[PDB]
Design an enzyme around this catalytic site. Sequence first.
Site, PDB file in Angstrom:
ATOM      1  N   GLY A 103       2.045   5.904   9.512  1.00 43.50           N
ATOM      2  CA  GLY A 103       3.472   5.942   9.228  1.00 43.50           C
ATOM      3  C   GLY A 103       4.212   4.748   9.822  1.00 43.50           C
ATOM      4  O   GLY A 103       5.343   4.462   9.414  1.00 43.50           O
ATOM      5  N   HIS A 135       0.815  -1.226   0.000  1.00 40.99           N
ATOM      6  CA  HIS A 135       0.000   0.000   0.000  1.00 40.99           C
ATOM      7  C   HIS A 135       0.850   1.279   0.000  1.00 40.99           C
ATOM      8  O   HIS A 135       0.291   2.359  -0.101  1.00 40.99           O
ATOM      9  CB  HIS A 135      -1.085   0.024   1.085  1.00 40.99           C
ATOM     10  CG  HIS A 135      -0.598   0.249   2.475  1.00 40.99           C
ATOM     11  ND1 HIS A 135      -0.535  -0.795   3.387  1.00 40.99           N
ATOM     12  CD2 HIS A 135      -0.257   1.397   3.104  1.00 40.99           C
ATOM     13  CE1 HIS A 135      -0.124  -0.256   4.525  1.00 40.99           C
ATOM     14  NE2 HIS A 135       0.063   1.057   4.406  1.00 40.99           N
ATOM     15  N   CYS A 163       3.451   1.653   9.336  1.00 44.80           N
ATOM     16  CA  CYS A 163       3.353   0.534   8.407  1.00 44.80           C
ATOM     17  C   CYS A 163       4.732   0.126   7.913  1.00 44.80           C
ATOM     18  O   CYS A 163       5.598   0.975   7.723  1.00 44.80           O
ATOM     19  CB  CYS A 163       2.410   0.874   7.260  1.00 44.80           C
ATOM     20  SG  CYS A 163       0.751   1.343   7.812  1.00 44.80           S
TER      21      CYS A 163
HETATM   22  C1  LIG Z   1      -4.315   5.299   7.014  1.00 45.50           C
HETATM   23  C2  LIG Z   1      -4.999   3.992   6.638  1.00 45.50           C
HETATM   24  C3  LIG Z   1      -4.093   2.745   6.730  1.00 45.50           C
HETATM   25  O1  LIG Z   1      -2.871   3.015   6.049  1.00 45.50           O
HETATM   26  C4  LIG Z   1      -3.817   2.398   8.231  1.00 45.50           C
HETATM   27  O2  LIG Z   1      -4.612   1.706   8.845  1.00 45.50           O
HETATM   28  N1  LIG Z   1      -2.711   2.930   8.798  1.00 45.50           N
HETATM   29  C5  LIG Z   1      -2.377   2.816  10.170  1.00 45.50           C
HETATM   30  C6  LIG Z   1      -1.685   1.714  10.668  1.00 45.50           C
HETATM   31  N2  LIG Z   1      -1.462   1.507  11.970  1.00 45.50           N
HETATM   32  C7  LIG Z   1      -1.918   2.429  12.825  1.00 45.50           C
HETATM   33  C8  LIG Z   1      -2.584   3.570  12.431  1.00 45.50           C
HETATM   34  C9  LIG Z   1      -2.834   3.790  11.080  1.00 45.50           C
HETATM   35  C10 LIG Z   1      -3.586   5.016  10.630  1.00 45.50           C
HETATM   36  C11 LIG Z   1      -4.760   1.524   6.094  1.00 45.50           C
HETATM   37  C12 LIG Z   1      -6.138   1.340   6.191  1.00 45.50           C
HETATM   38  C13 LIG Z   1      -6.739   0.204   5.675  1.00 45.50           C
HETATM   39  C14 LIG Z   1      -5.976  -0.765   5.042  1.00 45.50           C
HETATM   40  C15 LIG Z   1      -4.612  -0.577   4.950  1.00 45.50           C
HETATM   41 CL1  LIG Z   1      -3.635  -1.803   4.197  1.00 45.50          CL
HETATM   42  C16 LIG Z   1      -3.994   0.548   5.461  1.00 45.50           C
END
Ligand SMILES: CC[C@@](O)(C(=O)Nc1cnccc1C)c1cccc(Cl)c1
EC number: 3.4.19.12
Lengths: 304, 304
Positions: free
Chosen positions: B143, B41, B145
């Site tokens: 961030g 992603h 991820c």
């Molecule tokens: C901002 C959305 C997201 O990057 C995510 O959950 N990040 C995120 C990760 N860990 C903690 C807080 C946040 C915010 C997202 C959402 C749905 C699917 C996917 Cl693959 C990714």
Amino acid sequence: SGFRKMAFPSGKVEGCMVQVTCGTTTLNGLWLDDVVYCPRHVICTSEDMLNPNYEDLLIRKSNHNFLVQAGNVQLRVIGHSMQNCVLKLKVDTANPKTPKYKFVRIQPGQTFSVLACYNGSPSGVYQCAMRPNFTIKGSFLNGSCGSVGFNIDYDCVSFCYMHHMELPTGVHAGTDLEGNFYGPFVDRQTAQAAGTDTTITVNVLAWLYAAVINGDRWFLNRFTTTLNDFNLVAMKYNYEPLTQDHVDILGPLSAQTGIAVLDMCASLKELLQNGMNGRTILGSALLEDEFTPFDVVRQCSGVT
Amino acid sequence: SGFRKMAFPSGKVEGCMVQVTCGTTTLNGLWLDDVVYCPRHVICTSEDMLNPNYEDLLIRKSNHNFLVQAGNVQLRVIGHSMQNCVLKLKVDTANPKTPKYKFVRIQPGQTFSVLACYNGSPSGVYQCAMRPNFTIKGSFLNGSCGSVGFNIDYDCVSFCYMHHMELPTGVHAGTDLEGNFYGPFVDRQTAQAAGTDTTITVNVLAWLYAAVINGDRWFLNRFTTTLNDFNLVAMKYNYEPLTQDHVDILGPLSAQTGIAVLDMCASLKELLQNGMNGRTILGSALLEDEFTPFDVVRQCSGVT
Ligand SMILES: CC[C@@](O)(C(=O)Nc1cnccc1C)c1cccc(Cl)c1
Ligand SMILES: CC[C@@](O)(C(=O)Nc1cnccc1C)c1cccc(Cl)c1
């Protein structure tokens, strides 16, 4: 979101751990620049520990008696001196992995990460608070002596603790990196009293703010209190008295959440008086006091 | 003595973290040998996340669109491929700090350390369990991820998790290092159900043994039970059913303490039925399930 008891990344400290042997005793040392720091009780046998005369014991030791090994390479010892309860072994090689560092003496209630080591090898990392009674509730077995506590600010490691002993009560005692014990403790195998411990009130309030930030809000109530009314409750429950200095440090969390510090004190008052009624806060069934207001801001903002 | 939620020393993993940027999205990557692993992603904008076609999105990207930075030095990208939900960016330089490593897919109930990172920089380390429902209760912000979970056996790092997302419930979901999600989760911004979670029974029993080893014995009783009687109670309290495989893994702790596994099950049964009556076990007011029997032996024996 989520809130965990997070330790600092331990890499910079792992690169400083060495094994120190003197006679038949082996423990951990900390190699920074051309000096190895370790607990002075490395020079004792189990029989010496009951009532050691460190000055007399150290006089029977020469540089060649201190065996310092970093990984699998041996360090050459060119000097030795005792500073308070630590030994400083001057070596002929500066540690190439020496991070930017400082030696700091922390205050009770402050937190730090511990890198538990055995035979100069790291086994694990965990986050601790220096108790108001200057003990730490760690996880240490025989051979863990010399393991250190530290904090990191960007690229700088502030070493604040070196492990020396376990009290008969199962709690831990140690020194700053100048070899000065935190608390009344002496490096001798004799029963030693740790005074009454208290709960670190400012940390519990900081953790309550972390809970609100992460959605755990059930404990917020319609009440407020004063510093004097709150401290009457803190005294009754063996909590540290809250001061305006503590309120001031909670300022950023009060501003971010819009919950006045004295309103959070009233939530804490009701929790102390009524308990949690079988409920949890941030996955805990008790009031957590090993997160400082600084820790809460750092974790909740992703400081690296 | 003492028992802490201990994480593995993170140094070997810190040396692998890099920052990956594609377009306007930045996240963490893992640099092992000449390959950088990151969540696919990274190629999405916030608008793409609602319903991404990763194959079509990746086709508009070339090697030069993936900016990989390790500390302050830029890595040259010479290849890119998608494997399940991860991207593998082939670089022209092998990571000189690559530790001995393996990619492993852990089982639910197993534990691991997470090195939380932002912009390729480590912020903290904590110990997690993969929940029976394949979510993790971490501490992650936007961030984070690409941050990874791992275990260490002497000099070998077994990477088991890469962080991808936070569910609307505040719990976390991610993949193994081949990009296969743990659980039913998809890498899309749509509401996704995490099934019913259960308590990891074998871990609670392991932690009860750790408590006995460290002196917390108040919960030991004069009773015993059977696997079938215990499992009737486990079902009623949303605990995982205990099997002979679980009893077998508890064998070493049963041998060391002299407390038969079914006698410990009877202590756990009474704790489930009556609660802790305002008491604590290893400083916790609830039954802890994020320590495996392996973790208990390792911590209680000082494995480095
Ligand atoms: C901002 C959305 C997201 O990057 C995510 O959950 N990040 C995120 C990760 N860990 C903690 C807080 C946040 C915010 C997202 C959402 C749905 C699917 C996917 Cl693959 C990714
Ligand atoms: C074995 C005794 C001792 O080395 C110690 O507490 N070590 C020790 C340290 N942490 C955990 C477990 C153990 C066992 C000792 C005792 C009194 C005074 C001093 Cl300075 C040292």
